[PDB]
Each structure stands twice: as structure tokens, then as C-alpha cells.
Write a protein that binds this ligand. Structure first.
Ligand SMILES: O=C(CCCC[C@@H]1SC[C@@H]2NC(=O)N[C@@H]21)NCCCN(CCc1ccccn1)CCc1ccccn1
Ligand SMILES: O=C(CCCC[C@@H]1SC[C@@H]2NC(=O)N[C@@H]21)NCCCN(CCc1ccccn1)CCc1ccccn1
Ligand SMILES: O=C(CCCC[C@@H]1SC[C@@H]2NC(=O)N[C@@H]21)NCCCN(CCc1ccccn1)CCc1ccccn1
Ligand SMILES: O=C(CCCC[C@@H]1SC[C@@H]2NC(=O)N[C@@H]21)NCCCN(CCc1ccccn1)CCc1ccccn1
Ligand SMILES: [Cu+2]
Ligand SMILES: [Cu+2]
Ligand SMILES: [Cu+2]
Ligand SMILES: [Cu+2]
Ligand SMILES: [Cu+2]
Ligand SMILES: [Cu+2]
Ligand SMILES: [Cu+2]
Ligand SMILES: [Cu+2]
Lengths: 125, 125, 125, 125
């Protein structure tokens, strides 16, 4: 199994009130659903990603990332967000991320296609 | 099937000489392998992502993203890259991306954990 | 004078323990010094930037940005950081930023030239 | 004088057709005007920044950054862009940048306050 397979698997909440439900596979797979508290989004969206299943043992975090395309049976916001970050274990486990949200645009509007931000996920709240 | 399922599926090359091999699913899934021409990487790595399988019909691109965790049977660079961008069809199809590469770090080094960059993928070269 | 000229001018501290000393001009100028608690840096470095001297009056923040080139009389880290963000007034005034740190590189290493991160500045601590 | 003071000073054009007019000071100062071909912008805006006035001599680029607040006598877009990048000399001199465009927002909209992108500047076109 992945070193932090058990630590990552479960339900996570970020500072916006969004909910990230993920299962970590022994190989490095991440699968689950994402529910955003903000934006052009309703209910759950499929997510898939990857994590380092054998991280360093020197106190470093565990690198990971995942993607949501903002289309489900209710809405399509013609956009995708990728979160890139690291999982930090301990009494107050966290996933610290930065993210890129690209919207499909015309070529004329490509310069304003991508938002950047940062989300911190915790196991409570 | 996804509107650009056929357009996205296949082999892609970026400006660094890296190779991105992907299969787009009818639902929005992306699966494949990534081979980086630079960095602490050798051979192919698993990737997984998502794309908008029903994009706008007004000339906008198709939003997508995917993740590579840089661990395979040869190396582990304790890091993950996510690419966020859009697919643009036509005679010269392109996937235009920006990316975030997060390395697992100690808490003291978290401020320098994440590189940002941009890759353009084409079907030739 | 700028609407938040008085609110921005002064000494600010971020979550790393760095110190940002700035004077806002009536026109939109920002001038001052930056002292980083981390990285290849010692003592104060010149900074210069710009802010919106007539922001919206609807409760929106005040957009601003500034640059430090990491050369002073003690060290040269061959790099520059730009912070882009917004000033938020009130009892707990804050400057919320994201930043890009580019190092001079060879062309072969340009893909790993730029770190991205986020700093929050407060008037205390 | 700065090692690339003469190389940086002058008029630069990016891929959008915007015009960047800058003077590099011997100390590391950058001053000038920016005219954007896209967005909520008309005519010239003040810019100020910093560059490494004594870069490495090993073939590395020269790190630099600058800021524009998008207010002038014609318009105010309540936003600021910072470009962070490096100057590369030679027959085809370039300034390769990534940028962050933050708009003043309410706290509820802060998650969508910042665009990210990349501009390449050349001395022709
Ligand atoms: O909301 C979405 C899907 C939801 C995205 C939620 C984000 S993921 C990062 C973060 N962490 C989180 O938990 N939740 C947020 N996708 C289109 C994102 C359109 N713009 C902004 C929102 C909006 C809502 C309605 C109408 C127009 N926009 C993108 C910014 C932009 C740039 C240029 C022109 C227009 N818009
Ligand atoms: O190379 C990797 C895996 C390969 C990543 C390849 C990138 S994906 C984005 C881009 N598009 C592409 O096709 N290919 C590149 N992951 C660790 C990335 C360590 N640093 C830089 C490289 C390195 C190689 C050897 C020793 C040290 N580093 C990250 C930057 C950093 C910050 C602070 C301290 C140290 N390093
Ligand atoms: O430290 C600096 C100057 C200090 C920068 C301080 C940052 S500004 C953003 C943040 N907010 C803050 O208050 N403080 C920090 N500039 C070179 C930054 C070299 N790398 C990482 C540090 C380092 C220290 C010693 C030896 C090597 N690196 C950049 C990452 C990288 C990528 C690839 C290869 C190598 N390094
Ligand atoms: O245009 C501006 C000023 C011009 C900025 C020009 C950019 S600098 C980076 C790049 N290189 C360049 O040479 N030129 C461009 N500042 C507000 C930028 C508002 N949004 C997008 C544009 C817009 C125009 C009219 C009405 C609404 N927007 C920001 C994206 C966003 C996110 C969420 C909600 C709404 N908008
Ligand atoms: Cu190891
Ligand atoms: Cu806008
Ligand atoms: Cu639609
Ligand atoms: Cu370094
Ligand atoms: Cu206004
Ligand atoms: Cu490295
Ligand atoms: Cu040197
Ligand atoms: Cu929008």
C-alpha cells in the first residue's frame, strides 16, 4: 500500500467550504468527487489524480495533484481546475495546494483563460 | 462520445521534446503516459485527468487538465505536476497549458515547493 | 491623495516572518524595502510597485503589486520576485498576494526558472 | 552601469501586440509605460520594476519584474499585473515572463481575483 494511502483517503474541506472526497490507491491513483462551495458549480464532479506512493522519510510532505472538469449532469462551466500540492500528516493533517482553473475560450480571449489560487484542505470543518 | 474525444486521443509533443500519450473517454476521462525530456525523470509515468466532453460550440477551446506523479519503476522525484489548459482543434491542433510542479518539502522549505510554467503541445515534432 | 494611501503606507509582516516596508504615493507609486526571512537573502532590498489609487467603493479590495530584485550590497541571488494582490482594509487590514520568483537560468534550465507561492501580510507580528 | 542596462532599455512588443517601453537604471531600477492590446485598457500606463544589474556570467538570463496598476487618465480597471521573468540577450533578445493579474474583489469573490499567463517580449513586431 502507499505510505500515506490511509492518510489521504477520506473527506477533506477547504477554506471556501468545498468538499473533496478521495480514495488513494496503493499504486498512486487518486479517485473521487469534488463539490465546490463557489463558482459555476452544483453538486459533485468527478476527479482523478496521482500521488507519490513512496514519499521521502525525512519529514517532507507527499506530493499529489488532481483534476476536475466542471461538467456533470447538472451544469457545464466549460472549465477545468487542477490542484497541485502536498499532503502533510500529523495531528493536524493538511493538503496544501495551489491551483489553475482554465476556461475554454476563443483565441482572442485566451490571455484571460486561467485563474490561479491556493486552497488548504483539512479533515475538519 | 466526447465532442473532441477523437481530437485529443493520441500522441502529443511539447516544446521541451516531452511526449504525452493520452486516451480521452466518452465521459471526460483522460488516461495515458508522460515522458519528460527534462528534469528528474526517465521513461514513462502514469497520468490521469479530465476534459470537458461537451464544450461550447462558439469557437471556444476545450478545457482539460491532467496530473503526473513523478514516481515509476525507475525513479521517484517526490513531486507531481498538474497541467491545466485547453485543446484547440483545427489544421494545427494544439493543447495550450500552464502547469504547477509541487515537490514534497519540509515545512521550512514549503515556500519554494512549487514551480510554475507553460507547455504547448502539438501533434507533430 | 490615494484612497488607501494611508492604509497601505507602513510596515507589513507575512506568514514567513518577512518584513515589507512601503510608502504609497498619491499617484499610485509604491516604494520601500523588503527583508525576507527565508531564501538566499540578507538585510533589506529595494522594492517598487504600483497600486490603484482610486479603487471601487463597493467593498472591493485595492489592487496592487511590487517587485524585488534580490541584489543588494550583501548578496545577489540572481532572481526577482513580483507580488500581485489586493489590500483589504478594516480592523484586520491585510494584503493578500500571490507571487512569482524567477531566477536567471540557462536556456536549458528555463523550464525550472519560476517558483509560485502566496503571501498574506498583516500589520502585526 | 548595469550589465544589461543597455540591452533592456527600449521598446518591447509581446505576442498580443502590447508595447512595453522601459528604461533600466544603473542601480536596478525599471521605469516606463505599458500599452495593452487587450483587456480593459487604453493608451499608456505607468510601470515600475527592478532587474538584476549584475547577473551571472555563465550564460544565464537576467532576472527582472515590473508592475502596472491599470489606472490612468482614461480608465480604471481596478487591477494590477506583475510580470516576473528574465531577459535573454543575443541576436534575438527576448524577455520571457509569466504574469499575475489581480483585480480588486469583494471577499466573496477573492477566489477568482487572479489571472495567470505568460508573455514573451521581443524587440521587433
Ligand atoms: O466556476 C467554475 C467552476 C467552479 C470552480 C470553483 C473553484 S476551483 C478553485 C477553487 N477551489 C474551490 O473549492 N472552488 C474554487 N468555472 C468557470 C470559471 C468562470 N470564471 C469565474 C466564475 C464565473 C461564474 C459565473 C459566470 C462567470 N464566471 C473564470 C474567471 C473569468 C475570466 C475571464 C472572463 C470570465 N471569467
Ligand atoms: O524533475 C522532476 C520531474 C520532471 C518534471 C518535468 C517538468 S513537468 C513541467 C515541464 N514540462 C515537461 O514536459 N517537463 C517539465 N521533479 C522534481 C523537480 C525538482 N526541482 C527541479 C529539477 C531537479 C532535478 C535534480 C535535482 C533537483 N532538481 C524543483 C525546483 C526546486 C525548488 C527548490 C529547491 C530545489 N528544486
Ligand atoms: O532565495 C532567493 C531570494 C529570497 C526569496 C524569498 C521568497 S520571495 C516569495 C517569498 N516571500 C518571502 O517573504 N520570502 C520568499 N532567490 C533565489 C531562489 C533560488 N531557489 C530557491 C532558494 C535557494 C537558496 C540557496 C540555493 C538555492 N536555492 C529557486 C528554486 C529553484 C529551482 C530550480 C533550481 C534551483 N532552485
Ligand atoms: O483588463 C484589465 C487591464 C488590461 C490587462 C491586460 C493583460 S496584462 C497580462 C497580459 N499581457 C498584456 O499585454 N495584456 C494582458 N484588467 C481587468 C481584468 C478583468 N478581467 C478580464 C478582462 C475584462 C474586461 C472587461 C470586463 C471584464 N473583464 C479579469 C478576469 C475575471 C475573473 C473573474 C471575473 C471577471 N473577470
Ligand atoms: Cu527518496
Ligand atoms: Cu473580467
Ligand atoms: Cu455551454
Ligand atoms: Cu534554488
Ligand atoms: Cu470604478
Ligand atoms: Cu530541484
Ligand atoms: Cu553570481
Ligand atoms: Cu467567469
Amino acid at each position: 500500500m502507499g505510505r500515506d494511502e490511509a492518510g489521504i483517503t477520506g473527506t477533506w474541506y477547504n477554506q471556501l467550504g468545498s468538499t473533496f472526497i478521495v480514495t488513494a490507491g496503493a499504486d498512486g491513483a487518486l479517485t473521487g468527487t469534488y463539490e465546490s462551495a463557489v463558482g459555476n458549480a452544483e453538486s459533485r464532479y468527478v476527479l482523478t489524480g496521482r500521488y507519490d506512493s513512496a514519499p521521502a522519510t525525512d519529514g517532507s510532505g507527499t506530493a499529489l495533484g488532481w483534476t476536475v472538469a466542471w461538467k456533470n449532469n447538472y451544469r457545464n462551466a466549460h472549465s477545468a481546475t487542477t490542484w497541485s500540492g502536498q499532503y502533510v500528516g500529523g495531528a493536524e493533517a493538511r493538503i496544501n495546494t495551489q491551483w489553475l482553473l482554465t476556461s475554454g475560450t476563443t483565441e482572442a480571449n485566451a490571455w484571460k483563460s486561467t485563474l490561479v489560487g491556493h486552497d488548504t484542505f483539512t479533515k475538519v470543518k
